[PDB]
PDB file of C-alpha atoms and ligand atoms in Angstrom:
ATOM      1  CA  UNK A  14      35.545   4.888 -58.215  1.00  0.00           C
ATOM      2  CA  UNK A  15      37.364   3.919 -55.081  1.00  0.00           C
ATOM      3  CA  UNK A  16      36.722   6.190 -52.142  1.00  0.00           C
ATOM      4  CA  UNK A  17      40.251   7.400 -51.902  1.00  0.00           C
ATOM      5  CA  UNK A  18      40.557   8.180 -55.581  1.00  0.00           C
ATOM      6  CA  UNK A  19      37.352  10.294 -55.429  1.00  0.00           C
ATOM      7  CA  UNK A  20      38.645  11.996 -52.316  1.00  0.00           C
ATOM      8  CA  UNK A  21      42.158  12.887 -53.505  1.00  0.00           C
ATOM      9  CA  UNK A  22      41.298  13.573 -57.098  1.00  0.00           C
ATOM     10  CA  UNK A  23      38.054  15.387 -56.622  1.00  0.00           C
ATOM     11  CA  UNK A  24      36.619  16.118 -53.342  1.00  0.00           C
ATOM     12  CA  UNK A  25      39.803  17.652 -51.597  1.00  0.00           C
ATOM     13  CA  UNK A  26      40.731  19.806 -54.686  1.00  0.00           C
ATOM     14  CA  UNK A  27      37.239  21.066 -55.315  1.00  0.00           C
ATOM     15  CA  UNK A  28      36.422  21.682 -51.697  1.00  0.00           C
ATOM     16  CA  UNK A  29      39.611  23.696 -51.089  1.00  0.00           C
ATOM     17  CA  UNK A  30      39.246  25.743 -54.306  1.00  0.00           C
ATOM     18  CA  UNK A  31      35.382  26.239 -54.369  1.00  0.00           C
ATOM     19  CA  UNK A  32      34.093  25.078 -51.106  1.00  0.00           C
ATOM     20  CA  UNK A  33      31.403  23.113 -53.022  1.00  0.00           C
ATOM     21  CA  UNK A  34      31.684  19.689 -54.687  1.00  0.00           C
ATOM     22  CA  UNK A  35      29.336  17.607 -56.669  1.00  0.00           C
ATOM     23  CA  UNK A  36      29.783  13.876 -57.290  1.00  0.00           C
ATOM     24  CA  UNK A  37      27.299  12.323 -59.807  1.00  0.00           C
ATOM     25  CA  UNK A  38      26.478   8.564 -59.811  1.00  0.00           C
ATOM     26  CA  UNK A  39      27.902   7.974 -56.434  1.00  0.00           C
ATOM     27  CA  UNK A  40      26.368   4.714 -55.556  1.00  0.00           C
ATOM     28  CA  UNK A  41      24.943   3.570 -58.824  1.00  0.00           C
ATOM     29  CA  UNK A  42      21.312   2.796 -59.872  1.00  0.00           C
ATOM     30  CA  UNK A  43      20.762  -0.465 -57.852  1.00  0.00           C
ATOM     31  CA  UNK A  44      21.828   0.917 -54.514  1.00  0.00           C
ATOM     32  CA  UNK A  45      20.377   4.402 -55.288  1.00  0.00           C
ATOM     33  CA  UNK A  46      16.911   2.947 -56.010  1.00  0.00           C
ATOM     34  CA  UNK A  47      17.131   0.678 -52.842  1.00  0.00           C
ATOM     35  CA  UNK A  48      17.830   4.044 -50.735  1.00  0.00           C
ATOM     36  CA  UNK A  49      14.801   5.586 -52.545  1.00  0.00           C
ATOM     37  CA  UNK A  50      12.717   2.646 -51.449  1.00  0.00           C
ATOM     38  CA  UNK A  51      13.688   2.794 -47.816  1.00  0.00           C
ATOM     39  CA  UNK A  52      13.086   6.522 -47.772  1.00  0.00           C
ATOM     40  CA  UNK A  53       9.674   5.897 -49.323  1.00  0.00           C
ATOM     41  CA  UNK A  54       8.955   3.327 -46.754  1.00  0.00           C
ATOM     42  CA  UNK A  55       9.755   5.776 -43.913  1.00  0.00           C
ATOM     43  CA  UNK A  56       7.553   8.354 -45.532  1.00  0.00           C
ATOM     44  CA  UNK A  57       4.791   5.840 -46.263  1.00  0.00           C
ATOM     45  CA  UNK A  58       4.886   4.354 -42.680  1.00  0.00           C
ATOM     46  CA  UNK A  59       4.687   7.860 -40.998  1.00  0.00           C
ATOM     47  CA  UNK A  60       8.259   8.197 -39.583  1.00  0.00           C
ATOM     48  CA  UNK A  61       8.620  11.869 -40.772  1.00  0.00           C
ATOM     49  CA  UNK A  62       7.570  14.862 -38.761  1.00  0.00           C
ATOM     50  CA  UNK A  63       4.590  16.710 -40.288  1.00  0.00           C
ATOM     51  CA  UNK A  64       6.854  19.501 -41.741  1.00  0.00           C
ATOM     52  CA  UNK A  65       8.142  22.818 -40.861  1.00  0.00           C
ATOM     53  CA  UNK A  66       5.390  25.433 -40.161  1.00  0.00           C
ATOM     54  CA  UNK A  67       5.466  27.728 -43.134  1.00  0.00           C
ATOM     55  CA  UNK A  68       2.079  29.633 -42.986  1.00  0.00           C
ATOM     56  CA  UNK A  69       0.423  30.138 -39.615  1.00  0.00           C
ATOM     57  CA  UNK A  70      -3.225  30.982 -40.192  1.00  0.00           C
ATOM     58  CA  UNK A  71      -5.480  31.906 -37.462  1.00  0.00           C
ATOM     59  CA  UNK A  72      -7.461  29.064 -38.753  1.00  0.00           C
ATOM     60  CA  UNK A  73      -5.071  25.955 -38.348  1.00  0.00           C
ATOM     61  CA  UNK A  74      -6.905  23.823 -40.934  1.00  0.00           C
ATOM     62  CA  UNK A  75      -5.185  25.985 -43.528  1.00  0.00           C
ATOM     63  CA  UNK A  76      -1.716  25.841 -41.882  1.00  0.00           C
ATOM     64  CA  UNK A  77       0.996  25.366 -44.601  1.00  0.00           C
ATOM     65  CA  UNK A  78       3.920  22.934 -43.743  1.00  0.00           C
ATOM     66  CA  UNK A  79       7.063  22.387 -45.704  1.00  0.00           C
ATOM     67  CA  UNK A  80      10.055  20.110 -45.300  1.00  0.00           C
ATOM     68  CA  UNK A  81       9.515  17.146 -43.167  1.00  0.00           C
ATOM     69  CA  UNK A  82      12.450  15.266 -41.421  1.00  0.00           C
ATOM     70  CA  UNK A  83      13.387  12.247 -39.614  1.00  0.00           C
ATOM     71  CA  UNK A  84      16.613  11.385 -37.951  1.00  0.00           C
ATOM     72  CA  UNK A  85      18.111   8.028 -39.074  1.00  0.00           C
ATOM     73  CA  UNK A  86      21.128   6.150 -37.274  1.00  0.00           C
ATOM     74  CA  UNK A  87      21.530   3.665 -40.112  1.00  0.00           C
ATOM     75  CA  UNK A  88      20.945   0.530 -38.041  1.00  0.00           C
ATOM     76  CA  UNK A  89      17.289   0.607 -37.752  1.00  0.00           C
ATOM     77  CA  UNK A  90      15.020  -2.141 -39.474  1.00  0.00           C
ATOM     78  CA  UNK A  91      14.581  -1.101 -43.178  1.00  0.00           C
ATOM     79  CA  UNK A  92      17.231   1.599 -43.180  1.00  0.00           C
ATOM     80  CA  UNK A  93      20.171  -0.541 -43.907  1.00  0.00           C
ATOM     81  CA  UNK A  94      20.958   0.806 -47.258  1.00  0.00           C
ATOM     82  CA  UNK A  95      20.707   4.344 -45.802  1.00  0.00           C
ATOM     83  CA  UNK A  96      23.432   2.966 -43.231  1.00  0.00           C
ATOM     84  CA  UNK A  97      25.456   1.957 -46.240  1.00  0.00           C
ATOM     85  CA  UNK A  98      25.330   5.327 -47.712  1.00  0.00           C
ATOM     86  CA  UNK A  99      26.216   6.893 -44.363  1.00  0.00           C
ATOM     87  CA  UNK A 100      29.223   4.578 -44.228  1.00  0.00           C
ATOM     88  CA  UNK A 101      30.230   5.387 -47.818  1.00  0.00           C
ATOM     89  CA  UNK A 102      30.121   9.152 -47.078  1.00  0.00           C
ATOM     90  CA  UNK A 103      32.314   8.365 -43.928  1.00  0.00           C
ATOM     91  CA  UNK A 104      34.815   6.482 -45.949  1.00  0.00           C
ATOM     92  CA  UNK A 105      35.200   9.503 -48.282  1.00  0.00           C
ATOM     93  CA  UNK A 106      35.607  11.853 -45.422  1.00  0.00           C
ATOM     94  CA  UNK A 107      38.077   9.481 -43.671  1.00  0.00           C
ATOM     95  CA  UNK A 108      40.274   9.473 -46.979  1.00  0.00           C
ATOM     96  CA  UNK A 109      40.025  13.396 -46.927  1.00  0.00           C
ATOM     97  CA  UNK A 110      40.966  13.957 -43.447  1.00  0.00           C
ATOM     98  CA  UNK A 111      43.770  16.280 -42.931  1.00  0.00           C
ATOM     99  CA  UNK A 112      43.303  17.637 -46.359  1.00  0.00           C
ATOM    100  CA  UNK A 113      40.028  19.489 -45.860  1.00  0.00           C
ATOM    101  CA  UNK A 114      41.390  22.922 -45.049  1.00  0.00           C
ATOM    102  CA  UNK A 115      42.918  22.660 -41.566  1.00  0.00           C
ATOM    103  CA  UNK A 116      39.940  20.924 -40.017  1.00  0.00           C
ATOM    104  CA  UNK A 117      40.358  17.644 -38.304  1.00  0.00           C
ATOM    105  CA  UNK A 118      36.964  15.763 -38.583  1.00  0.00           C
ATOM    106  CA  UNK A 119      36.313  13.568 -35.617  1.00  0.00           C
ATOM    107  CA  UNK A 120      32.498  12.748 -36.195  1.00  0.00           C
ATOM    108  CA  UNK A 121      29.214  13.413 -37.566  1.00  0.00           C
ATOM    109  CA  UNK A 122      25.582  13.641 -36.924  1.00  0.00           C
ATOM    110  CA  UNK A 123      22.994  11.161 -37.654  1.00  0.00           C
ATOM    111  CA  UNK A 124      21.329  11.258 -41.075  1.00  0.00           C
ATOM    112  CA  UNK A 125      18.748  13.911 -41.529  1.00  0.00           C
ATOM    113  CA  UNK A 126      16.298  12.412 -44.000  1.00  0.00           C
ATOM    114  CA  UNK A 127      14.250  15.436 -45.663  1.00  0.00           C
ATOM    115  CA  UNK A 128      11.116  15.112 -47.482  1.00  0.00           C
ATOM    116  CA  UNK A 129       9.697  18.141 -49.466  1.00  0.00           C
ATOM    117  CA  UNK A 130       6.112  17.102 -49.950  1.00  0.00           C
ATOM    118  CA  UNK A 131       5.739  19.085 -53.407  1.00  0.00           C
ATOM    119  CA  UNK A 132       3.310  21.800 -52.364  1.00  0.00           C
ATOM    120  CA  UNK A 133       5.297  24.711 -53.425  1.00  0.00           C
ATOM    121  CA  UNK A 134       7.487  24.873 -50.248  1.00  0.00           C
ATOM    122  CA  UNK A 135      11.191  25.280 -50.236  1.00  0.00           C
ATOM    123  CA  UNK A 136      13.730  26.191 -47.641  1.00  0.00           C
ATOM    124  CA  UNK A 137      14.458  29.767 -46.847  1.00  0.00           C
ATOM    125  CA  UNK A 138      18.081  31.256 -47.416  1.00  0.00           C
ATOM    126  CA  UNK A 139      20.146  30.159 -44.381  1.00  0.00           C
ATOM    127  CA  UNK A 140      23.630  29.064 -43.281  1.00  0.00           C
ATOM    128  CA  UNK A 141      23.707  25.678 -41.720  1.00  0.00           C
ATOM    129  CA  UNK A 142      26.269  26.555 -39.028  1.00  0.00           C
ATOM    130  CA  UNK A 143      26.541  30.420 -38.497  1.00  0.00           C
ATOM    131  CA  UNK A 144      27.486  30.362 -34.819  1.00  0.00           C
ATOM    132  CA  UNK A 145      30.408  27.820 -34.330  1.00  0.00           C
ATOM    133  CA  UNK A 146      28.518  24.672 -33.353  1.00  0.00           C
ATOM    134  CA  UNK A 147      31.207  22.412 -34.630  1.00  0.00           C
ATOM    135  CA  UNK A 148      29.793  21.379 -37.976  1.00  0.00           C
ATOM    136  CA  UNK A 149      32.339  22.135 -40.757  1.00  0.00           C
ATOM    137  CA  UNK A 150      30.985  20.118 -43.665  1.00  0.00           C
ATOM    138  CA  UNK A 151      27.551  19.589 -45.011  1.00  0.00           C
ATOM    139  CA  UNK A 152      27.139  16.329 -47.118  1.00  0.00           C
ATOM    140  CA  UNK A 153      23.860  15.849 -48.995  1.00  0.00           C
ATOM    141  CA  UNK A 154      22.839  12.771 -51.037  1.00  0.00           C
ATOM    142  CA  UNK A 155      19.778  13.155 -53.397  1.00  0.00           C
ATOM    143  CA  UNK A 156      17.622  10.357 -54.738  1.00  0.00           C
ATOM    144  CA  UNK A 157      15.007  11.862 -56.977  1.00  0.00           C
ATOM    145  CA  UNK A 158      14.671   9.873 -60.086  1.00  0.00           C
ATOM    146  CA  UNK A 159      14.485  11.803 -63.448  1.00  0.00           C
ATOM    147  CA  UNK A 160      14.047  15.156 -61.680  1.00  0.00           C
ATOM    148  CA  UNK A 161      13.652  18.222 -63.925  1.00  0.00           C
ATOM    149  CA  UNK A 162      13.709  21.541 -62.163  1.00  0.00           C
ATOM    150  CA  UNK A 163      12.292  23.558 -64.970  1.00  0.00           C
ATOM    151  CA  UNK A 164       9.137  21.471 -64.182  1.00  0.00           C
ATOM    152  CA  UNK A 165       9.312  20.447 -60.639  1.00  0.00           C
ATOM    153  CA  UNK A 166      11.466  23.258 -59.054  1.00  0.00           C
ATOM    154  CA  UNK A 167      13.642  22.197 -55.977  1.00  0.00           C
ATOM    155  CA  UNK A 168      16.936  23.644 -56.984  1.00  0.00           C
ATOM    156  CA  UNK A 169      19.351  24.053 -54.240  1.00  0.00           C
ATOM    157  CA  UNK A 170      20.945  27.553 -54.621  1.00  0.00           C
ATOM    158  CA  UNK A 171      24.191  28.314 -53.033  1.00  0.00           C
ATOM    159  CA  UNK A 172      25.629  31.948 -52.807  1.00  0.00           C
ATOM    160  CA  UNK A 173      29.313  31.550 -52.132  1.00  0.00           C
ATOM    161  CA  UNK A 174      30.429  34.332 -49.840  1.00  0.00           C
ATOM    162  CA  UNK A 175      32.009  37.265 -51.687  1.00  0.00           C
ATOM    163  CA  UNK A 176      30.856  36.230 -55.123  1.00  0.00           C
ATOM    164  CA  UNK A 177      28.481  38.035 -57.518  1.00  0.00           C
ATOM    165  CA  UNK A 178      26.925  34.636 -58.605  1.00  0.00           C
ATOM    166  CA  UNK A 179      25.260  31.731 -57.204  1.00  0.00           C
ATOM    167  CA  UNK A 180      25.431  28.011 -58.008  1.00  0.00           C
ATOM    168  CA  UNK A 181      22.250  26.085 -58.830  1.00  0.00           C
ATOM    169  CA  UNK A 182      22.325  22.432 -57.960  1.00  0.00           C
ATOM    170  CA  UNK A 183      19.586  20.099 -59.112  1.00  0.00           C
ATOM    171  CA  UNK A 184      18.553  17.392 -56.522  1.00  0.00           C
ATOM    172  CA  UNK A 185      19.472  14.587 -58.977  1.00  0.00           C
ATOM    173  CA  UNK A 186      19.081  10.892 -58.386  1.00  0.00           C
ATOM    174  CA  UNK A 187      22.302   9.450 -56.890  1.00  0.00           C
ATOM    175  CA  UNK A 188      23.970  12.638 -56.612  1.00  0.00           C
ATOM    176  CA  UNK A 189      26.339  13.663 -53.704  1.00  0.00           C
ATOM    177  CA  UNK A 190      27.104  17.139 -52.635  1.00  0.00           C
ATOM    178  CA  UNK A 191      29.594  18.531 -50.079  1.00  0.00           C
ATOM    179  CA  UNK A 192      30.051  22.157 -49.074  1.00  0.00           C
ATOM    180  CA  UNK A 193      31.359  24.130 -46.091  1.00  0.00           C
ATOM    181  CA  UNK A 194      28.773  24.413 -43.521  1.00  0.00           C
ATOM    182  CA  UNK A 195      29.717  27.829 -42.215  1.00  0.00           C
ATOM    183  CA  UNK A 196      28.961  31.463 -43.573  1.00  0.00           C
ATOM    184  CA  UNK A 197      30.710  30.960 -46.809  1.00  0.00           C
ATOM    185  CA  UNK A 198      27.781  29.027 -48.125  1.00  0.00           C
ATOM    186  CA  UNK A 199      24.505  30.515 -47.533  1.00  0.00           C
ATOM    187  CA  UNK A 200      21.896  28.469 -49.537  1.00  0.00           C
ATOM    188  CA  UNK A 201      18.151  27.989 -50.029  1.00  0.00           C
ATOM    189  CA  UNK A 202      15.839  25.507 -51.606  1.00  0.00           C
ATOM    190  CA  UNK A 203      13.575  26.868 -54.231  1.00  0.00           C
ATOM    191  CA  UNK A 204       9.878  25.796 -54.149  1.00  0.00           C
ATOM    192  CA  UNK A 205       9.312  22.233 -54.894  1.00  0.00           C
ATOM    193  CA  UNK A 206       6.231  21.095 -56.882  1.00  0.00           C
ATOM    194  CA  UNK A 207       6.940  17.397 -56.636  1.00  0.00           C
ATOM    195  CA  UNK A 208       7.986  15.193 -53.615  1.00  0.00           C
ATOM    196  CA  UNK A 209      11.818  15.730 -53.066  1.00  0.00           C
ATOM    197  CA  UNK A 210      13.791  13.741 -50.925  1.00  0.00           C
ATOM    198  CA  UNK A 211      17.404  14.325 -49.596  1.00  0.00           C
ATOM    199  CA  UNK A 212      19.877  12.701 -47.065  1.00  0.00           C
ATOM    200  CA  UNK A 213      22.071  14.889 -45.071  1.00  0.00           C
ATOM    201  CA  UNK A 214      24.714  14.318 -42.611  1.00  0.00           C
ATOM    202  CA  UNK A 215      27.149  17.022 -41.105  1.00  0.00           C
ATOM    203  CA  UNK A 216      30.798  16.493 -40.196  1.00  0.00           C
ATOM    204  CA  UNK A 217      32.220  17.957 -37.035  1.00  0.00           C
ATOM    205  CA  UNK A 218      35.713  19.597 -36.656  1.00  0.00           C
ATOM    206  CA  UNK A 219      37.320  18.491 -33.536  1.00  0.00           C
ATOM    207  CA  UNK A 220      38.403  21.806 -32.133  1.00  0.00           C
ATOM    208  CA  UNK A 221      35.316  23.858 -32.934  1.00  0.00           C
ATOM    209  CA  UNK A 222      33.029  21.081 -31.458  1.00  0.00           C
ATOM    210  CA  UNK A 223      35.316  20.902 -28.289  1.00  0.00           C
ATOM    211  CA  UNK A 224      34.427  24.532 -27.763  1.00  0.00           C
ATOM    212  CA  UNK A 225      30.821  24.379 -28.767  1.00  0.00           C
ATOM    213  CA  UNK A 226      30.622  22.210 -25.622  1.00  0.00           C
ATOM    214  CA  UNK A 227      30.841  25.253 -23.310  1.00  0.00           C
ATOM    215  CA  UNK A 228      29.390  27.623 -25.873  1.00  0.00           C
ATOM    216  CA  UNK A 229      26.328  25.355 -25.390  1.00  0.00           C
ATOM    217  CA  UNK A 230      26.288  25.233 -21.577  1.00  0.00           C
ATOM    218  CA  UNK A 234      27.625  19.818 -19.165  1.00  0.00           C
ATOM    219  CA  UNK A 235      28.377  19.310 -15.597  1.00  0.00           C
ATOM    220  CA  UNK A 236      29.692  17.012 -13.024  1.00  0.00           C
ATOM    221  CA  UNK A 237      28.826  16.540  -9.289  1.00  0.00           C
ATOM    222  CA  UNK A 238      31.262  17.759  -6.624  1.00  0.00           C
TER     223      UNK A 238
HETATM  224  O1  A1Z B   1      17.394  20.077 -49.153  1.00  0.00           O
HETATM  225  C1  A1Z B   1      18.387  20.604 -49.674  1.00  0.00           C
HETATM  226  O2  A1Z B   1      18.851  20.430 -50.953  1.00  0.00           O
HETATM  227  C2  A1Z B   1      18.984  21.631 -48.958  1.00  0.00           C
HETATM  228  N1  A1Z B   1      18.443  21.523 -47.785  1.00  0.00           N
HETATM  229  C3  A1Z B   1      19.196  22.375 -46.465  1.00  0.00           C
HETATM  230  O3  A1Z B   1      19.859  23.003 -46.824  1.00  0.00           O
HETATM  231  C4  A1Z B   1      18.825  22.245 -45.077  1.00  0.00           C
HETATM  232  N2  A1Z B   1      19.624  22.892 -44.295  1.00  0.00           N
HETATM  233  C5  A1Z B   1      19.465  22.848 -43.003  1.00  0.00           C
HETATM  234  C6  A1Z B   1      18.235  22.206 -42.518  1.00  0.00           C
HETATM  235  C7  A1Z B   1      18.045  22.196 -40.885  1.00  0.00           C
HETATM  236  C8  A1Z B   1      18.241  23.513 -40.189  1.00  0.00           C
HETATM  237  C9  A1Z B   1      18.089  23.665 -39.019  1.00  0.00           C
HETATM  238  C10 A1Z B   1      17.722  22.325 -38.228  1.00  0.00           C
HETATM  239  C11 A1Z B   1      17.480  21.120 -38.959  1.00  0.00           C
HETATM  240 CL1  A1Z B   1      17.010  19.617 -38.071  1.00  0.00          CL
HETATM  241  C12 A1Z B   1      17.746  21.017 -40.337  1.00  0.00           C
HETATM  242  C13 A1Z B   1      17.442  21.484 -43.307  1.00  0.00           C
HETATM  243  C14 A1Z B   1      17.611  21.470 -44.651  1.00  0.00           C
HETATM  244  O4  A1Z B   1      16.708  20.891 -45.496  1.00  0.00           O
HETATM  245 MN1   MN B   2      21.031  23.905 -45.253  1.00  0.00          MN
END
């Protein structure tokens, strides 16, 4: 689908009604697989961190580490289909802008590529932006071929604020997810028992970000 049709007919209505939006088959199989290939090359060539420290034992040979990450700008050698994904996410947001609540989105982070190594680690319940650091929208792309959570775990579970229910999102190949980054969407990743990849970017609201400058300390000489 053309970005604008997806934006006006799906992302804008879903985001304003539910604060969560899932688009399946975002880029198609060829491109999705190429992204899988590039992420796997990053992993295989040692570009990820070792992983979040999950269990600190007094013996460090038995430390457990979880999600591994690497920040990707999209123009690096071997990351160009990742850059293509980032640009397609941006096209969608650009065609939403002015219609996502009353936010005015004026930028985004680099891509955070995540690798859950499959050792029973997940990601604890959290809010992405709990303290007003400028990020208003979380965008995640999943590239896990034939993922079956009943077998491999790794569900993303969101707990929309105020609701007595949660939303389980499988990290399915070629799946695109949007949700409000703030306290309306606490979420977690349940333990993953197979290698699980995701690519996240966060979009900034202009006003909040302009205040996060001072809430986060920048100076100029006299
Ligand atoms: O993988 C999924 O399906 C869901 N992942 C997350 O929700 C997540 N959220 C936040 C973070 C994160 C939180 C703080 C700092 C940094 Cl660099 C990353 C990582 C994360 O992996
Ligand atoms: Mn998160």
